[PDB]
Amino acid sequence: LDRADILYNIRQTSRPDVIPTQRDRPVAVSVSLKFINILEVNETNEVDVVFWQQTTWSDRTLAWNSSHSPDQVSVPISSLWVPDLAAYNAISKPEVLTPQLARVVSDGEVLYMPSIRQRFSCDVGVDTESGATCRIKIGSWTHHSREISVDPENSDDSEYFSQYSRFEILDVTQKKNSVTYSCCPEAYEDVEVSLNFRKK
Amino acid sequence: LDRADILYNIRQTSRPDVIPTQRDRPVAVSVSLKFINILEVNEITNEVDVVFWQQTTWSDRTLAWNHSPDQVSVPISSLWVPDLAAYNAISKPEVLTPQLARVVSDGEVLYMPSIRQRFSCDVSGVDTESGATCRIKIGSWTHHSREISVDPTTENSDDSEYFSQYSRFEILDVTQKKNSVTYSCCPEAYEDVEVSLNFRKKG
Amino acid sequence: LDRADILYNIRQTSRPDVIPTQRDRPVAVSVSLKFINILEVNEITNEVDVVFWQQTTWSDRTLAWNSSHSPDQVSVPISSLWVPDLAAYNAISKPEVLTPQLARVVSDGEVLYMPSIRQRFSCDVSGVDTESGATCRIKIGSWTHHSREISVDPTTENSDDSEYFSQYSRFEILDVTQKKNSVTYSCCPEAYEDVEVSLNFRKKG
Amino acid sequence: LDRADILYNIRQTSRPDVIPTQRDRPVAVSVSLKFINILEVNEITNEVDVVFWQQTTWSDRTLAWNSSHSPDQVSVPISSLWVPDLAAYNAISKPEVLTPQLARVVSDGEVLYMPSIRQRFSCDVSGVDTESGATCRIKIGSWTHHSREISVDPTENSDDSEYFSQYSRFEILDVTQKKNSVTYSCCPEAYEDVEVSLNFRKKG
Amino acid sequence: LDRADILYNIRQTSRPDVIPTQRDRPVAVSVSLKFINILEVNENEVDVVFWQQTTWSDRTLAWNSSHSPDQVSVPISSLWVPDLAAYNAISKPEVLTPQLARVVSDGEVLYMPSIRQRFSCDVSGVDTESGATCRIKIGSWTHHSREISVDPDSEYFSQYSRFEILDVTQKKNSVTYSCCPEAYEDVEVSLNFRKKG
Amino acid sequence: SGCCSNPACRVNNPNIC
Amino acid sequence: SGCCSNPACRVNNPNIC
Amino acid sequence: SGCCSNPACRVNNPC
Amino acid sequence: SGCCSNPACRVNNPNIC
Amino acid sequence: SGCCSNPACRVNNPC
């Protein structure tokens, strides 16, 4: 198969509304936020940030034979199912700055990493030596752990964050929180992104 | 039936323009606003910029099915939604979250988007101990009570466990009440849900 | 006929691009602005931000149905219907529709569309603090059709100026006037109509 | 025969991607800017916020119909028609169309589109408070076609206005629209543009 | 073939989702930024307007030029376009001009939109003699050098601008990481500018 | 009529408002 | 002509405006 | 239960 | 000449600009 | 890895 054949198959058998749950087991979604810039800080207790959201999951229905065929293809996300990930403490609609394309591997693995400009409710502190800490809670908006399982490193600054920014990253720590309520048998997962930063 | 089969059936038999009035009875819509954040307060223009979760529930028996999943996540574009609007609104409601609703096997639709919207409210004495009580009136834009019945989930008077601790403002009390008025002209009743947000500045 | 049957018929026989001119007589469009709020007044740029309900009514006989053992009225999205090409000839901003884009269609073919619109207008806002206040002139009319295709009318209503106006607004309505202006130019035989909305308002104190 | 038939024919035979060049002759596009309002002037970064009616006329013979026992004109949405790729070279903002996106099509194939556009421009707004005021020059032209595909023309131009807002903070002194046809040494085809000069000052 | 026939063929055989990799060799994309205006500089984001001249070949669009037009104007929605993005961008690129590309009979596509975009560039020292150099990193968002190969005063810059261009340099950077066999390319655009006085 | 102050009512009763 | 000051009139009368 | 404070839980358990 | 300074000219003449 | 700092590299090599 050539790239055109692979892309036609994906487009024609496109079920973006259908979650790729392979026999009851949840879709393993891996999320990692890489901060590029901290633009505005207002005191309202708001923070305007630009970050790369590395999202990976498997969709076995997209898989193809890699023998004498490309190993990977670039597919627009409109032709693919995407997890309903949302920041619970978000005050702004997430603005996608980059081409809305995902990288699909022959094994069915989907790698989507858009650059997002978003405002968050955080305790801004910012001018202090200790620096203000900004807590972001990312999770599925409508699915529980048995449908979508979310997973996150706990360090790195790194090469991502702009040297020309007015702010400075102190530490970024991404942790998985799994809470099972008394009401309900299914667990509820989220990825808590802690961004502590200060003004230069 | 699997998830794909259920979602295909919903998509193919999709009538979002058609109100699911079962046996000429109105669509029982349940609305409840859960305030997440109060961003800006302009005492000069009497405006308030707020973030809130709008828990909207109703039944659409045409979506019902049934060794199959009990619930599925469906995009609202494939479903009929009530024409709810805040008469007290100054800005267009901005949906911040993925536009998906949860549909249960019985036909029940649960849609809860996070909305950022500006409202005309008496923000006089926000710094005071009593604070300001911002009232919002939600109702159907084109249907009467015999087509869509709007009801408040709570009363409440409950404050919030969802409201941000990092907000510049503090919730005192949230009160959601149903108002049903029948005019002398017309036989059909007219309903609305009056939300009352009592809040003050932290200092 | 049930609601689903009526809505399917409207959707399938949908001609939103086609003006419902019956027997070569114009479509009688009735427009009436009901002011809700006056938000911002900018002395620097001479602008005004207004919130208003635009009650637009007209007849589209092709949408008509037998009301016997059928609903008298249905709610139809405006995308499935023809709408008049109404515009404020003096507007500085694009009209922002705040409400669900749905119209009420009666069994006789009458269409009632009333969206809530947030729009900026060119206004001499000097003396908004004065007793006389400031007046905003909005000239509403069809963008491409003349009186022989779309006729425009303001209604006989004149006693509701502040009936919908927010009590929490920083401004106060003095006088609202919506008059019909029919001008026939020397060039052309067809008349040209517009509805001139005058909004007189002042700051509270 | 009727409006519905004419509109269906236009919709079904719709080629908005196809330039209506008849017999290898360019499309005669006539452009005329009528200024309605000047909203903001940024003396700092030399910017100007303006509202104007862009009267654009051209002929598309494929849209033509027999006017005998049929309407002479119809209102067609521009999405169903080919439109010239006109753009302001000195534009700093995306043109915002404020009015219903409808054009008037005559039985002879003539298309008349006149949207109200709110746009920001890079202009020398130095001495806007002075008696001579500021002159803001806007150059309009086809983004991808040369004179042999689209011929642009200004439709008089002096001096305005009966259109401009009396309630505006600014005052129009003179509006001039001139055609500029330049043929470069490289290339045999000519390159056309319409230079719109807006002379304006702040009121008392 | 006439213009209508060429445009119908392009529209009907339209594969905008398919990269035109001919004989497994990468798509040679040529990018050149021509600055028109520098609007705002705030205390550290810069708001600029620039023409992005993008050229590449798509052999599937080719036609016989004999008794047919040599070139046609095609809307980019009917064509494949490279997934070029600025890595240091803070705002979504705003296309100001008609979204049309010029397609030649040999399959060459020439797209040049006018883009208004904000960037992260240090605003300290814009009033000084040397000014402040603004670095812009353009590259493919999802493709490597084996799929899309990127290649790089002004006589375009407005005389009415508050700023003045000192020098514009566009360089190709090809980096091969230790992990991975394929090379990674980008075009580094360095805009040196200062405030007028 | 209080109906005229309501948006749903106004469009539901053209004869009254 | 006063017709030219009107939008509906301009587009309806190409010969006049 | 703290389920009501969660968006995925509130819609899954008709709080 | 100044073809390269023109948008329509730059796209029409790939050999020159 | 320097690859992780690159967008095209991150998605093509499943850091």
Numbering used by the authors:
A (entry chain D): 1 to 43, 45 to 125, 127 to 154, 157 to 204
B (entry chain C): 1 to 66, 69 to 205
C (entry chain A): 1 to 205
D (entry chain E): 1 to 155, 157 to 205
E (entry chain B): 1 to 43, 46 to 154, 161 to 205
F (entry chain F), G (entry chain H), I (entry chain G): 1 to 17
H (entry chain J), J (entry chain I): 1 to 14, 17
Q: What's the paper's own text on this?
A:
The structure of the LsIA and Ls-AChBP complex was determined at 2.8 Å and solved using molecular replacement. The asymmetric unit contains one pentamer with LsIA bound to all five binding pockets. The diffraction data and electron density maps were well defined except for certain residues on flexible loops (mostly AChBP loop F) that were excluded from the final model. LsIA retains the typical α-conotoxin binding orientation with solvent exposed N- and C-termini oriented to the bottom and the top of the pocket respectively and the α-helical backbone buried into the binding pocket. Interestingly, LsIA R10 forms unique hydrogen bonds with AChBP Q55 (3.2 ± 0.11 Å) and Y164 (3.2 ± 0.26 Å) on the minus face of the ligand binding pocket. In addition to the interactions of the variable residues, unique interactions of LsIA N12 with Q73 (2.9 ± 0.05 Å), R104 (3.2 ± 0.07 Å) on the variable minus face(16,37) of the ligand binding pocket were also observed.
Neuronal nicotinic acetylcholine receptors (nAChRs) are ligand gated ion channels involved in the modulation of neurotransmission in the central and peripheral nervous system. α-Conotoxins are a large family of disulfide rich peptide antagonists of the nAChRs isolated from the venom of marine cone snails.
